[PDB]
Design an enzyme around this catalytic site. Structure first.
Site, PDB file in Angstrom:
ATOM      1  N   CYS A 138       0.839  -1.221   0.000  1.00 32.30           N
ATOM      2  CA  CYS A 138       0.000   0.000   0.000  1.00 32.30           C
ATOM      3  C   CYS A 138       0.852   1.240   0.000  1.00 32.30           C
ATOM      4  O   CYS A 138       2.040   1.221   0.425  1.00 32.30           O
ATOM      5  CB  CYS A 138      -0.873   0.071   1.269  1.00 32.30           C
ATOM      6  SG  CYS A 138      -1.756  -1.472   1.601  1.00 32.30           S
ATOM      7  N   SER A 139       0.213   2.324  -0.455  1.00 30.07           N
ATOM      8  CA  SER A 139       0.853   3.620  -0.531  1.00 30.07           C
ATOM      9  C   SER A 139      -0.206   4.643  -0.150  1.00 30.07           C
ATOM     10  O   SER A 139      -1.402   4.423  -0.349  1.00 30.07           O
ATOM     11  CB  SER A 139       1.324   3.867  -1.974  1.00 30.07           C
ATOM     12  OG  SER A 139       2.119   2.746  -2.428  1.00 30.07           O
ATOM     13  N   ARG A 192       8.223   2.910  -3.775  1.00 30.10           N
ATOM     14  CA  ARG A 192       6.864   3.515  -3.756  1.00 30.10           C
ATOM     15  C   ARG A 192       6.874   4.847  -2.965  1.00 30.10           C
ATOM     16  O   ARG A 192       6.256   5.858  -3.378  1.00 30.10           O
ATOM     17  CB  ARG A 192       5.853   2.538  -3.177  1.00 30.10           C
ATOM     18  CG  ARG A 192       5.611   1.306  -4.044  1.00 30.10           C
ATOM     19  CD  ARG A 192       4.323   0.616  -3.682  1.00 30.10           C
ATOM     20  NE  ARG A 192       4.063   0.507  -2.203  1.00 30.10           N
ATOM     21  CZ  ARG A 192       4.447  -0.520  -1.435  1.00 30.10           C
ATOM     22  NH1 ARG A 192       5.156  -1.535  -1.941  1.00 30.10           N
ATOM     23  NH2 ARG A 192       4.109  -0.581  -0.128  1.00 30.10           N
TER      24      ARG A 192
END
Ligand SMILES: [Cl-]
Ligand SMILES: [Cl-]
Ligand SMILES: [Cl-]
Ligand SMILES: [Cl-]
Lengths: 330, 330, 330, 330
Positions: A1-2, A228
């Site tokens: 996730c980001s 990321r």
């Protein structure tokens, strides 16, 4: 996730995240009304009556709603993201605290806090415990980000030494390692900019870029949490400021496209495909929640305040996994 | 700009592109009907009658429709993309040929060709000339890609030495340098894969990845044409095969998400913002044309065959630059 | 600067470093005999008697010899390296300690310590102070590495929060940031190996590497302290184990060849060349000190034990900055 | 292997190479006197009388001396380097040419050519044939570089289409792909400079480099041929000009230290260590030949002109694999 937050020109704070994972447990948009009651631990029936209603993405598969991210009626925004090999939880609560399952942290905070300082105060009354859940079979390794109506953001990390709080951060968070490590890592990439490098000569040879974009040389394109973090941080810095709430959602999703993971491009060590299941954004001032899905590029929106925040039941909105194509002619 | 084609499991060919530029001249979806007539040069009143109807994105600002990309009624797809410092044009036609303005190439080819061999055979009776146009003020440096109904792709490059043709390519094209250079560059990155590296030790220290995605180590994250080619090519290789046309569009747009440029992230040496204005996809078998815009994440579609292909006038569809947000409540 | 230790298969421990700077203050190989005495501070008269003789590279320009690195007669090795933006020193000594000038740390430690535990105890007795010196004009920002005859290495970093000690490290150290940061950063590069990636196809196209060395894809080639750390650490990991002291020296200098900086390649923001002035190696068991210089590839050696360890003066050996080319014919 | 030429401030041309291989067939420095004679092919009897004496590294294991690199008495310098997957040889000579074994090309050219013009004319008289040799057991895939006393360099590549000649190149060559590919690849890295990037803000956070060297961000540090070409080219560009022949050798060797491969760090797919066996330099004006070895950092020199150039036999000099350490105690 980001994840990241931005502020608009018209004084609005927005927060957005990608949810990257290997399976789609039944997930939907959940509005939790006031005084619904949220468990602390799944294996105990102690319930905290929540002061505040909130809306976000989550699961209704266990006793209380598990929110992955969301915004409450007081403008507090937050999310849980993965934190593999760093997250550390206790077997028993420390003196003066109650245990909490790591997957109920967002629901508990959005239910009960307004400012990022409230959040820091709240979490001192709890110890995250190593309690499993039936959706995953184990306690996921997590860390947490919150942004309040003022635009201040914090990161909370359950590290081996204890809870590590980071105040007034740059408003970007991905996965491991800890926030200080990535914050320091930023310094190695300050040469990544929008501007092209000057032409050079080697001997009698003139050398110029192939086209555009050569100012970004050195930024990595892989999907590791450190790469990321860099892409989300650098592109947050250089993407034009959003003038209003809509441009804020649009821009957030453009910045997160650089970390959107197609199915098949990242596999776990067991060969499971880890992909961007959804992308969501939320606005502290309006309390609107927005999302698009892997299979549907059309953004949907739910307004928290539109509902009866004293409802007895959860209000839910189901995903539409059909690509929502506007037919311009038959 | 960046582009690629894919094949689905139900035997369809699709092609897609981003359009990256510094300005938005009046552009729309254009259907050009059969027997409309397309100029070869903007300054001369010689036209070729086009055998075939086609649809795509383009401009109606000069005498004949200028198509940036599109698909024709016989399944041929293609696009013009930038080719700075390489594209070379003549002042006068080679003997035996007529001159053609570089911006009219896609219109002429979609209007008259079915197969990629047809295109190759067709381009021998023309010389690209350095004729300007009113939209930009100069002839832009361009190269061209085509994919026919069978899925075969070709690249046509106007090099200093003459037209260079690459046949049966990997179905990926961005900007400069020429196609053989990019195809050779692929070999330096064959270690970019979905799979994680094995853990190692240094002395007594075990070292494991931060999370997922480390198989991608080495892939660049900047927006140069060489980095864009790598990302499109490698993510084309590893993204799951599309099962049908709708998965095709969705997957094409996910692969292109990796080369979608937010406003402000890339500046030219004149300080202008170079950003992804639109992303389109088209399908050889259905002759459907699909697009989304910088400010509008919802995909729209136009069907070529739904219209009167013997119509006298162009049929156009205007962009909707409002983020088309589905409101789930009130 | 860059540094590492290795262990040979005949049970010897060696340590080596590059010295990278923008100018060459008068430096030479210095043997400090037993009972010579070393100041703690330039501005105070206290001289600590040293129990042990030691040899290393250093300066005689201030009151007592300043050693940049070296080995003592009990096999303790160490070096001071740059630590810009991180090193922080006090104005006055902490309760129950004596102040020490940062540049006298290696001289004091080599003169009085045998094991890495001894070093840790010795340092608790001191506070590093912001006292300048005439060689540079300021107190330089430094951190310290030591490796004892057993091959255990430690890092000592004067951080803003106080002295940070890292025990049983991987035996690599460069410059900023802190050792924990770099040791975490190692994890992002575990895919850097000697082994080539397997061939792949893209459609009908077979893709194979250009030659050899593709297992290293992802490893950075610049001369930043993080990049230098990765290259020293990964090349330490995969370089064949040394079987004896001479192979140990040879191997150390090969690994450091990857961080050897030619003049002109790295400039400061004043445009001064920052280059590798010398490269040194030393061996705990033999008490031999080896070095080569920017202008002389031939390794020179000085044996500590060959000299009078009870000498009443320093014994120094001057640099030979002429390339020492062996003429094989007239 | 990796190679480059430079020009000194005192107007001398020097050329240097590393030899990277997985085995060390008996090799030494060879002076081939005038009129010694060199075979074109191992399986045919013709010996071509050589007009000129030359010196360089090579093998005496087959019929005529095989030189890997060297300089002749008229100041022509050259080398053969690996060219895997690109080198293409014929089964029979083309009409009007003589067949030649690829391993004899350097000996024949150094024996008979003065200028790069001459080398080109000479290569047009041959066809490289797929003839093996007993050192390797197969015809190695090769390409060739030459630099004359004027300092002009050429590259000659036996491609699938035929011999490709590149005139007045940048004076750098490694291995595959072909020279034009590498020359174009240089353009992607023009942002690699000695100078630090400017500090930036992110929110209220001030970001500055860790140390020095950050201008190099983007330059790869692995040992593939493309990465080696970039490092040799960019460091040839920015390394200070050598003021005389001796500085020339020292600088060439500093530039090549960036592509010096320690044993163990690169393995082939048959698990063989590919490492830098030796590093040599030569000067066109003095006809001096210089070299160091994996196990001996001290440079040795052979002067061509010191010998009887009309000698009947080869004059050879053996490698000294002992690290040649100057002992300073006395
Ligand atoms: Cl471009
Ligand atoms: Cl991850
Ligand atoms: Cl190679
Ligand atoms: Cl540094």
């Amino acid at each position: 996730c980001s994840s990241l937050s931005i502020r608009t020109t018209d004084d609005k704070s927005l927060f957005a995240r990608t949810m990257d994972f290997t399976m789609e447990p039944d997930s939907k948009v959940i509005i939790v009304p006031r005084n619904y009651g949220i468990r602390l631990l799944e294996k105990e029936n102690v319930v905290i009556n929540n002061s505040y209603a909130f809306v976000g993405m989550g699961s209704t598969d266990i006793t209380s709603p598990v929110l992955y991210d969301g915004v409450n009626e007081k403008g507090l925004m937050g999310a849980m993201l993965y934190y593999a090999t760093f997250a550390t939880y206790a077997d028993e609560p420390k003196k003066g605290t109650r245990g909490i399952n790591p997957v109920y942290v967002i629901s508990q905070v959005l239910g009960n806090c307004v400012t990022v300082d409230d959040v820091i105060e709240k979490l001192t009354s709890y110890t995250l415990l190593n309690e499993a859940n039936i959706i995953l079979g184990f306690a996921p390794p997590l860390h947490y980000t919150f942004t309040d109506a003022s635009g201040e953001s914090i990161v909370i990390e359950p590290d081996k030494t204890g809870i590590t709080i980071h105040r007034k951060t740059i408003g970007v968070m991905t996965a491991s390692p800890g926030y200080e490590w990535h914050q320091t890592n930023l310094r190695a990439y300050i040469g990544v900019t929008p501007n092209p490098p000057q032409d050079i000569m080697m001997g009698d040879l003139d050398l110029t870029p192939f086209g555009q974009g050569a100012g970004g040389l050195g930024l990595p394109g892989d999907f590791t949490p450190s790469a990321r973090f860099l892409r989300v941080a650098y592109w947050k810095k250089y993407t034009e400021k959003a003038k209003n709430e809509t441009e804020g959602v649009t821009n957030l999703f453009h910045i997160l496209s650089s970390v959107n993971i197609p199915k098949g491009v990242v596999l776990t060590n067991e060969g499971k495909t880890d992909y961007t299941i959804y992308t969501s954004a939320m606005c502290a001032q309006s309390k609107n929640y927005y999302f698009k899905l892997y299979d549907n590029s059309r953004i949907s929106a739910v307004s928290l305040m539109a509902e009866n925040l004293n409802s007895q039941d959860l209000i839910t909105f189901e995903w539409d996994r059909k690509q929502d194509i506007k037919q311009l002619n038959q």
